[PDB]
Amino acid sequence: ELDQLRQEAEQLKNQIRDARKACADATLSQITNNIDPVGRIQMRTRRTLRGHLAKIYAMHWGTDSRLLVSASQDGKLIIWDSYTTNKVHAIPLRSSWVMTCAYAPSGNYVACGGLDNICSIYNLKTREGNVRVSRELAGHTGYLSCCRFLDDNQIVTSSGDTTCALWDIETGQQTTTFTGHTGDVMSLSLAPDTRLFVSGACDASAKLWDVREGMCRQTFTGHESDINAICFFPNGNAFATGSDDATCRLFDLRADQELMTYSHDNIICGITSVSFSKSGRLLLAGYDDFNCNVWDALKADRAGVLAGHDNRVSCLGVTDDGMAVATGSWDSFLKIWN
Amino acid sequence: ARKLVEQLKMEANIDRIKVSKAAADLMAYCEAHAKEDPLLTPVPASENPF
Amino acid sequence: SLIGKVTVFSVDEFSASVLTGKLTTVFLPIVYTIVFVVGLPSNGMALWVFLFRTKKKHPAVIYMANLALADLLSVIWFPLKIAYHIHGNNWIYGEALCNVLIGFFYGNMYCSILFMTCLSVQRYWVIVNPMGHSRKKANIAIGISLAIWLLILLVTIPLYVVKQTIFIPALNITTCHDVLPEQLLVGDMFNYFLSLAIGVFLFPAFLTASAYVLMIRMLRSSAMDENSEKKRKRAIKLIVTVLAMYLICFTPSNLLLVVHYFLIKSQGQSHVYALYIVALCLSTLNSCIDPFVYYFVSHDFRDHAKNAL
Amino acid sequence: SAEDKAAVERSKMIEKQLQKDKQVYRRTLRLLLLGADNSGKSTIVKQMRISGIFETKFQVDKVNFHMFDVGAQRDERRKWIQCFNDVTAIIFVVDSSDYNRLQEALNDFKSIWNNRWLRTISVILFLNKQDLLAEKVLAGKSKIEDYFPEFARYTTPEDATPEPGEDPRVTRAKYFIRKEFVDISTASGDGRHICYPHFTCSVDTENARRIFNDCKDIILQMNLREYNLV
């Protein structure tokens, strides 16, 4: 009759709201306002890399804090060493629209995908020295927006058809499929222990997922529009989200509520990428105002500003040993800050 | 509607803690590794590859 | 420019009339002061914008910055000249400065001319043949800028190797470039000045005029799309204006220069000096008119300038 | 000095390859094709012929065109339309003999005209299926007044250029349909991009020439803007 089910859903939502309002005993701006302010943080460019003909859409750091991968709408993958600005590899693509990259934790493989509705998996260590495509995964019905590795045998993938999936490399078949979103899935992140992951999908909503089960653990709401970036806190019990309403927010996983909201009255632009630092104090963000901001996590104030790009900042990343920060924007240049 | 009801039912029964506990844990982790971050505490120029 | 006979020198009656009159003690300093006050900040601001806030080096900026610098260096030592003219045609400031003033004036004028010509040719090359490459243009622009400057610093040497100040006791005056000996006007200087007047004005004039006329005739052809008229028509207007500020402000000076030296080396008299002073007054106004025609009639440049201040 | 000898070899080889690729790339033009389901964009594509997104290439007077058709996607497109900010022309193909889904066509045109990431791109407008329009108007069983009553106040402009043999009624209909789009085009008054209308049918072979002429004009306007001449 469609009436009883909606009534039960409303009752359950009311119960959840009461449970969440019961645990909201204080605001964290009250028990974090007597700490030593970080100060003034300023950074300068140490190097600049050239060679792309068009916009840079994504990038990723390796596990040695030395080698990196980047890719553009030219149809080009480039593998750099950042110690000496010299190139090591260049790979051409079979399609000209690609929107995500990755880097295997062992240094042997790379992965890519785009509007062609297919994932491409490339091998780097061959006896002939020539990089040739190894695997190719198809089965989605929409543009592919992110892809990461767990080991050399499994790849987790997110697409624009409101679904996510886990793939087994050898057989070429999906092992499990995650459904439950209602709109375009854009941002994905893996837990540091490689046990869970988190996703956000253009409905002003975010969700947590277990890998081996295949069902939602918990769902968070609170934004006003699409969600574009997502990342884990280093310790494994928090994540910070960026949206198109000019706001960053922080959530934990045990209280199911907002903790800090970072925003400003003079900002009416979007967020394109977000990342964290090793200790957990510095939060970096890239905006459409042609610049980037650096914030502190426990204070809800500003610390500094990075400038130097002539277009939108599209990709950002911070290394595994904490030594440098890399950025790439629509002007076809990558920059490194320390 | 049935799927939404099932989702809300499974989400309802979750153990929850107080916010100040999570705040304490986060500030504790921030303090414990404060000295090892090469951006809050800048590295001496000698050992910096950059 | 005026002939002094024969060290004590002497001059004739018309020269005496002009050197102590009101044309060269009242009129000229007004023009120079107005030019100075109007033109110094304009090129200063243009050069600031072209040097600091530019993000990418397009060829047009490469040529325009050089033109602006040429005008700026042309307009520096004017106060010395106003002080000269107001004191009654008498120079009391030494010897090096006379050479500096003459050389910088003439060299910077002709550098301005050559850069105008280069802009014209590149505009033709782009519009009447749409295909091109930006980086090769940047390389060629830098090369040609260096060539032009080095050529200029090689035809202002003969003005540093001739004594320019001459003493006249009959009036108690000392003169910087207005009086010169007869045994030099009929000789070396005749050759040098006709060489400059026919070498670095006429040929660039033909090049520039031909390029702009062909561009207009192609932009009004009956083989172009009719959904663009309101833009193309505007373009025509600007082109005409530029030609107008080129031929009017430069042809009279060179013509009267040639005529003056022809009268001196042909017959032996001189009664055309006042017209040359006035035509040169007209020529020196382009240090103030150029930034309003090549720089400010656009869209983005005005916004950048407003953001600068 | 060191033992690192690939540190020059690999860099030099890769630089050579990228230079060759740059010279190949910068001489091509790229176009995006949009339309509805009942539009005849597929027939046009097949005529100048000689999953994700479909792709075609053609060559006119030694210039290479590369055209992109959006394929098996979902209905909502507000997120991947931002990947087309560096193309020269949007080719918009709209039906002309339906009278029902025409308003949705105008509204979509308005939406793609005022988007923020596409305020420096021009539109070439193709109105397809003309002979059907002629036959349908001559049949006279359906009146345009039931959907655009303002047609009752429209008269042919004095500068009309009809091909001989056509009744003035069909000419009036054609010009009214064109006028709606042109007015919505000029409504902004932005003065940074232009709309180029044409009429076309199911069997015609001069579409490549039209695209070439329009692209040539677009490049010329860009160059005039760039050199402080306009």
Could you give the 3-state DSSP secondary structure of residue C272?
coil
Phi, psi (degrees; rounded to nearest 5) at A130: -100, 125
Q: CB neighbours of A23 closer than 8 A, spacing ≥ 6?
A: A255, A257, B16, B17, B18, B19
Chain C residue with CA closest to D227: the answer is C60
Please state the φ and ψ torsions of residue C54, each to the nearest 5 degrees: -75, 130
A90-93 contacts: CB < 8 A, separation 24 or more?
A90/D14, A90/D17, A90/D18, A91/A122, A91/A131, A93/A120
Phi-psi region of D22 (alpha: psi -120 to 50; beta: other; left: phi over 0): alpha
Rg (CA), chain D: 22
Resolution of the experimental structure, in angstroms: 3.2
Scanning every residue of chain A, which has its alpha carbon at the shortest distance from the alpha carbon of B8? A12
**Tokens read off for C241:** 């204006």
Nearest of C101, C90, C114 to residue C32 by alpha carbon:
C101
Please name which of C262, C256, C258, C261 lies closest in space to residue C280, comparing C-alpha atoms.
Answer: C256
Contacts of C235 in chain D (CB under 8 A): 224, 229-230
* CA–CA distance, B3 with A253 (Å, rounded to integer): 23
List chain B residues with CB under 8 Å of A216: 7, 10-11
Domains (range + CATH), chain B: 1-50 (4.10.260.10)
What is the CATH number for C58? 1.20.1070.10
Cα→Cα distances A242→A271, A290, A302, Å? 6, 16, 16
Sign of CA dihedral A242, A243, A245, A249: negative
- Whole-number Å distance between alpha carbons of C241 and D229: 11
Beta bridge partners of A48: A335
Question: What chain D residue is nearest to C229 in terms of C-alpha separation?
Answer: D221
* Sequence letter at residue D180: E
E strand or H helix at D34, and its extent? strand D28-35
3-state secondary structure of D40: coil
Six token digits for residue C148:
């032009």
Alpha carbons A26 and C77: distance in angstroms, whole number:
73
CA distance A228 to D179: 41
B27 and A298 Cβ atoms separated by less than 8 Å? yes
Nearest residue on chain A to B45, alpha-carbon basis: A338
| C-alpha distance from C286 to closest chain D C-alpha (Å) | 19
Q: Which residue has the tokens 């426990």?
A: A298
Q: How many domains does chain D have?
A: 1
DSSP tag of A329: E
User: Rounded distance, CA C39 to CA C295, Å?
Assistant: 13
Residue C6's contacts (CB-CB under 8 Å, 6 or more residues apart) are: C181, C182
DSSP state of A87: E
**Domain carrying residue D21:** 6-226
How many angstroms separate the CA atoms of C244 and C241, rounded? 5
**Pairing mode, strands C179-181 and A154-159:** unpaired
Range of the domain at C133: 2-308
User: The tokens 């003065």 sit on which residue?
Assistant: D191
Distance CA A68, CA A81 (A): 7
Report which DSSP code applies to C5. B
**Total structural domains in chain C?**
1
Task: Check CB contact of D228 with chain C, cutoff 8 Å.
Answer: yes
Q: Do A255 and B43 touch (CB under 8 A)?
A: no
**Residue D90: how many CB atoms within 10 A of its CB?**
19
Q: What secondary structure letter does DSSP report for A36?
A: -
Nearest CA in chain D to A114: D52
B26 contacts in A (CB within 8 Å)?
A: 233, 238, 252, 280, 297-298
Q: Give me the domain span that covers residue A17.
A: 2-337
How would DSSP label each residue in C186-220?
IIIIHHHHHHHHIIIIIHHHHHHHHHHHHHHHHHT
Residue D230 to residue D219: CA distance in whole angstroms: 14
Residue D161: list chain C partners with CB under 8 A: none
- What is the count of residue pairs from A and D with beta carbons less than 8 Å apart? 57
Count CB neighbours of A267 within 10 A. Answer: 15
Q: How far apart are CA A201 and CA A164, in angstroms?
A: 11
Q: ∠ at Cα C179 (C173, C181), nearest 5°?
A: 120
Q: Return the C-alpha torsion angle D85, D91, D96, D101, nearest 10.
A: -30
d(CA C56, CA C67): 19
Q: Which residues from chain D sit within 8 angstroms of residue C130, using beta carbons? A: 216, 219-220, 223
What phi and psi, each to the nearest 5 degrees, are found at residue A333? -135, 140
Contact flag B11-A280 (C-beta cutoff 8 Å):
no
**Contact in structure between A321 and B43 (CB atoms under 8 Å):** no
Packed helices D207-226 and C229-247: angle between N→C axes, nearest 10 degrees? 40
D179, part of any domain: yes
Question: Is residue D1 a part of any domain in this protein?
Answer: no
- Cα angle: D205, vertex C229, D217; to 5 degrees: 40
Triad A101, A323, A186: Cα angle to 5°:
30
Strands D89-94 and D28-35: parallel
Q: What is the CATH number of the domain that holds A146?
A: 2.130.10.10
Is B23's CB within 8 Å of A31's CB? yes
Residue A129: partners with Cβ closer than 8 Å, 6 or more residues away: none
CATH code, domain with D105: 3.40.50.300
Contact D60, D209 (CB under 8 A): yes
Residues from chain D that touch A288, judged by Cβ atoms under 8 A, are none
C-beta neighbour count of A214 within 10 angstroms: 14
DSSP D147-198: T-GGGGG----TT--PPTT--HHHHHHHHHHHHHHHHHHHTS---S--EEEE
- Distance (Å) from the alpha carbon of A243 to chain D's nearest alpha carbon: 14
The bridge status of strand C2-4 relative to strand C179-181 is parallel
User: Could you tell me if D173 and D137 are in contact, meaning their C-beta atoms sit under 8 angstroms apart?
Assistant: yes
Q: How many domains does chain A have?
A: 1
